[PDB]
From a paper:
RSV F, a class I viral fusion protein responsible for fusing the viral and host-cell membranes, is the target of palivizumab and the majority of neutralizing antibodies (nAb) raised by natural infection. The mature F protein undergoes large-scale conformational changes during viral entry and, upon insertion of its fusion peptide (N-terminus of F1) into the host-cell membrane, it transitions from a compact metastable prefusion state (PreF) to an elongated, energetically favorable postfusion conformation (PostF). To fully elucidate the RSB1 paratope and the targeted PreF epitope architecture and better understand the competition with multiple antigenic sites, we determined the crystal structure of the DS-Cav1-RSB1 Fab complex, as well as the RSB1 Fab Apo structure, at 3.7 Å and 2.0 Å resolution, respectively.
Here we solved the X-ray crystal structure of the RSB1 Fab in complex with DS-Cav1, showing that RSB1 recognizes antigenic site V, and also revealing structural similarities and key differences in binding modes with the recently reported antibody CR9501. The specificity of RSB1 for the PreF conformation rather than PostF is structurally explained by the epitope contacts becoming dramatically distally rearranged in PostF, with PreF elements transitioning between 50–100 Å in the post-fusion conformation. In agreement with our hypothesis based on the biochemical data, we found that RSB1 mostly recognizes antigenic site V, making light chain contacts with DS-Cav1 helices α2–3 on the F1 subunit, while also recognizing portions of F2 and site Ø on helix α1 with the heavy chain. The Fab light chain CDR (LCDR) loops exclusively contact the F1 subunit of a single protomer and occupy a surface area of ~320 Å2. The HCDR3 projects its hydrophobic tip into a central, partially buried core on DS-Cav1, forming van der Waals (vdWs) contacts through Leu100.
Author numbering:
A (entry chain B): 137 to 509
B (entry chain A): 26 to 97
C (entry chain H): 1 to 52, 52A, 53 to 82, 82A, 82B, 82C, 83 to 100, 100A, ...
D (entry chain L): 1 to 9, 11 to 27, 27A, 27B, 27C, 28 to 95, 95A, 96 to 106, ...
Write the structure that this text describes.
């Protein structure tokens, strides 16, 4: 819910710099002379930056040597039809690149197989200034590598079509992460109204990063493999590690945890990694079901939890929820709900992004202002 | 093991521990080049079906090059 | 088949400007760039500038920077060029050439017949033509005492081309030139065929058709 | 950004190989293998015969073969013919929409036969005499040796006033042309008997005579 607390940045500027360098007068000639021998080379541009240069398709070597010495030989009539297919190949990829860059306007956020084939991407990963661990990670998750890599069309001149494929680096690797799920916590008083609700707004991802915590509220930035959590720190907040305390002791003096106050008596279901949280309030139906044994639980009013072991379904109202069937040990930390610490007439009825300290300060203000009369 | 999860009934929140990381820190750029030649005004009959197909492909190639030049 | 027409020749005064047009008849909508090259009487051409009409992108040589502005109308597929502040050193035969594709070709493939720009101080003077009456025979027309140096001779408005021969101009001591042209014709055709010479003067809008009577 | 340096002239008899060098700076050549040679028959726009470092267009003889090595190009013609008579022009790509031109080499073959000049003289017609003017016109053509000399003789007496003379220029048949104008008043014309235009060519003098009739 903190999604609007992020700063803005540029996603492709690191490639636009290389393009502005490639637009120099004697730039493309250097790259062409370098690739005149092999398909890939290391090229020191005129700005000191060393880049990898891959020649994925050589049509001049095909046109001026095999096709045009047939069309322009003499007597245009070709004997065999094999030339038509040989030219449909080696040109389908250029046509597809043109068709892609026409509708995407220079930058395609997933690098397609036509921009960079899988074998070419694997070779590029193998020949990168990265460690063996990062090489293996990218080789095993080429799909996620494509998800976070742009392809900026750069230049076409001097018989050379150029585009810079800007890839993710994955500097932080194998530092343990954890996902924080949240659900509204409301009192279960018998009244139809005057029911208070507290929620945690720090939901998302958390990762160890240089002694601090990289926290991702926007779940789009993080893809998830079996146990690997790929993320993008361009849309990440940087917190002290003590924010993790907000899991074990929310009233700690170190980190002021972020919460949310509301007065909404609506039930909800939050599917977690290896289970499901159910905030069942009012007359809403809440049923944990199984594929074999029909129904296995009916949730009492409050915020409860079930593990994905044996549970195949959580249904709240008319809303169905298929639980994630991944193995893992769940634990139920028993403890009194926090919402039972405050009073209805003093609890702030409306504060979107609040905290323990801010809610306590508003409580102080209201209590003092009422008692001074 | 390697994936454990806790549910904190106190705050009505769950935490999924046991996940490793791969955080995008910066970027790496590499130049991918396609070398193209020119089919400069080849003149030849379009009566035969095979040569007509060849011309249908030559026009596609030339238009692709020109359109790449245009989109800039 | 594919070619480009070129404007006619003209004459200006030192300090004025000359605007030379170059229209093409090929099309293809490609990224072709028109290049301007005005040689001289002196040996050697001299590359001046270039323009890609599809984008309006231009680039001029350092010898004429700040002096020439090359333009191009995309609707009529015509590329102009305007050279202001003329000097007698800038008298040349302004050609017009293209390259097929700016990214695939790096050499000129097709040209234009070109125009001729003379910039001097003396006033212009439309020429005077007089006929010249005659195996075979020979007749022709003479053109003398004009200031410009574009002069084109034509016979029967394009129906007589064999045996024709036009000589380069002389330099009379009065600062003016003089031109001549000759045509070889059979003997008996002098009494039946009517021979008319066509001298279409470009810089002074003069068109005189002289009938050389045998 | 100055022009390229080419030899001002080379030549070769039929059955011989001629190489024309084209030297430039590191920017023009040496870096870009984009060179182009053009020929120009005086009186027409050029037409190229090499469209890359060593590539020739459609309709160019195999004897034309270009090369390049370290800021120096080499246009080679094998088995010279009487058709390869023009001013060759070396050109090179220099950058984004920037080409540099060579100083031009002048290739005219040594092997070619002499041709006697065909002279023709014309007297002033009626329209010119009706305007107080008279100009004798002596037209020379089809002389291969460039050396010609005109000398006007009024009744076997030399005239040294009003004689103009053109410069021998190449024709479409590779045999040169010329022209000479003698200007005179109408009384200076109607007061003599016979004028002469003597065109000296390798010793052989060709003459033409005119008269007030």
């Amino acid at each position: 819910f903190l999604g609007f607390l992020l700063g803005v940045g540029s996603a492709i500027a690191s490639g636009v710099a290389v393009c502005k360098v490639l637009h120099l007068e004697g730039e493309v000639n250097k790259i062409k002379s370098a690739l005149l021998s092999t398909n890939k080379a290391v090229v020191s541009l005129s700005n000191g930056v060393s880049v990898l240069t891959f020649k994925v398709l050589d049509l001049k070597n095909y046109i001026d040597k095999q096709l045009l010495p047939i069309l322009n030989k003499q007597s245009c009539s070709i004997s065999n039809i094999e030339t038509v297919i040989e030219f449909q190949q080696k040109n389908n990829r250029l046509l597809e690149i043109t068709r892609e860059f026409s509708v995407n306007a220079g930058v395609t956020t997933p690098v397609s197989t036509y921009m960079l084939t899988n074998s070419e991407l694997l070779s590029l990963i193998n020949d990168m200034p990265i460690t063996n661990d990062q090489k293996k990670l990218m080789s095993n998750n080429v799909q996620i590598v494509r998800q976070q890599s742009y392809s900026i069309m750069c230049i076409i001149k001097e018989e050379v079509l150029a585009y810079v494929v800007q890839l993710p680096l994955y500097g932080v690797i194998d530092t343990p992460c954890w996902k924080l799920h949240t659900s509204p916590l409301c009192t279960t008083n018998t009244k139809e109204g005057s029911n208070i609700c507290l929620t945690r707004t720090d939901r998302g991802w958390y990762c160890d990063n240089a002694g601090s915590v990289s926290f991702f509220p926007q779940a789009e930035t993080c893809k998830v493999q079996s146990n690997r959590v790929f993320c993008d720190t361009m849309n990440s907040l940087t917190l002290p590690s003590e924010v993790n305390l907000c899991n074990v002791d929310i009233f700690n003096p170190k980190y002021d945890c972020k919460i949310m106050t509301s007065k909404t008596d609506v039930s909800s279901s939050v599917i977690t990694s290896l289970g499901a949280i159910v905030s069942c309030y009012g007359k809403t139906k809440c049923t944990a079901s199984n594929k074999n044994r029909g129904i296995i639980k009916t949730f009492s009013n409050g915020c409860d939890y079930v593990s994905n072991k044996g549970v195949d379904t959580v249904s709240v109202g008319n809303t169905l929820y298929y639980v994630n069937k991944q193995e893992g040990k769940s634990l139920y930390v028993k403890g009194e709900p926090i919402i039972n610490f405050y009073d209805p007439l003093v609890f702030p009825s409306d504060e979107f992004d609040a905290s323990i300290s801010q809610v306590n300060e508003k409580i102080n203000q209201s209590l003092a202002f009422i008692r001074k009369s | 093991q390697n994936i454990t999860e806790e549910f904190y009934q106190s705050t009505c929140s769950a935490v999924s521990k046991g996940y490793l990381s791969a955080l995008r820190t910066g970027w790496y750029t590499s130049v991918i080049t396609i070398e193209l030649s020119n089919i400069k005004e080849n003149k030849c009959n379009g009566t035969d079906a095979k040569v007509k197909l060849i011309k249908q492909e030559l026009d596609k190639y030339k238009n692709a090059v020109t359109e790449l030049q245009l989109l800039m | 088949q594919v070619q480009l027409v070129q404007s006619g020749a003209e004459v200006k005064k030192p300090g004025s400007s000359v605007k030379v047009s170059c229209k093409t008849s090929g099309g293809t909508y490609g990224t072709y760039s028109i290049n301007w090259v005005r040689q001289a009487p002196g040996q050697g051409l001299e590359w001046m500038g270039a323009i890609i009409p599809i984008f309006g992108k231009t680039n001029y040589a350092q010898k004429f920077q700040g002096r020439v502005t090359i333009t191009a109308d995309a609707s009529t597929s015509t590329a102009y060029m305007e050279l202001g502040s003329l000097t007698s050193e800038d008298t040349a035969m302004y050609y017009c050439a293209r390259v097929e594709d700016t990214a695939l070709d790096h050499y000129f493939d097709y040209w234009g017949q070109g125009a001729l720009v003379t910039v001097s101080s003396a006033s212009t003077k439309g020429p005077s033509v007089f006929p010249l009456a005659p195996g075979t025979a020979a007749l022709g027309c003479l053109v003398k005492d004009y200031f410009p140096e574009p002069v084109t001779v034509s016979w029967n408005s394009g129906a007589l081309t064999s045996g024709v021969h036009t000589f380069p101009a002389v330099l009379q001591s009065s600062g003016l030139y003089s031109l001549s042209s000759v045509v070889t014709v059979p003997s008996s055709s002098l009494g039946t065929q009517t021979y008319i010479c066509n001298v279409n003067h470009k810089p002074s809008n003069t068109k005189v058709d002289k009938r050389v009577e045998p | 950004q100055s022009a390229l340096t080419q030899p001002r002239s080379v030549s070769g008899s039929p059955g011989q190989s001629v190489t024309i060098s084209c030297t430039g700076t590191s920017g023009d050549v040496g870096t870009y293998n984009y060179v182009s040679w053009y020929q120009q028959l005086p009186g027409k726009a050029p037409k190229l015969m090499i469209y890359d470092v060593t590539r020739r267009p459609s309709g160019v003889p195999d004897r034309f073969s270009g090369s390049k090595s370290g800021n120096t190009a080499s246009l080679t013609i094998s088995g010279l013919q009487a058709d390869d008579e023009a001013d060759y022009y070396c050109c090179s790509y220099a950058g984004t929409l920037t080409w540099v031109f060579g100083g031009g080499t002048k290739l005219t073959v040594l092997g070619q036969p002499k041709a006697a000049p065909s002279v023709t003289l014309f007297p002033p017609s009626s329209e010119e005499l009706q305007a107080n003017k008279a100009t004798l016109v002596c037209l020379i053509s089809d002389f291969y040796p460039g050396a010609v000399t005109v000398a006007w003789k009024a009744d076997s007496s030399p005239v040294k006033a009003g004689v103009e003379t053109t410069t021998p220029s190449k024709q479409s048949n590779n045999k040169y042309a010329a022209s000479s104008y003698l200007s005179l008043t109408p009384e200076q014309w109607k007061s003599h008997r016979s004028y002469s235009c003597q065109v000296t060519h390798e010793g052989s003098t060709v003459e033409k005579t005119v008269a007030p009739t």
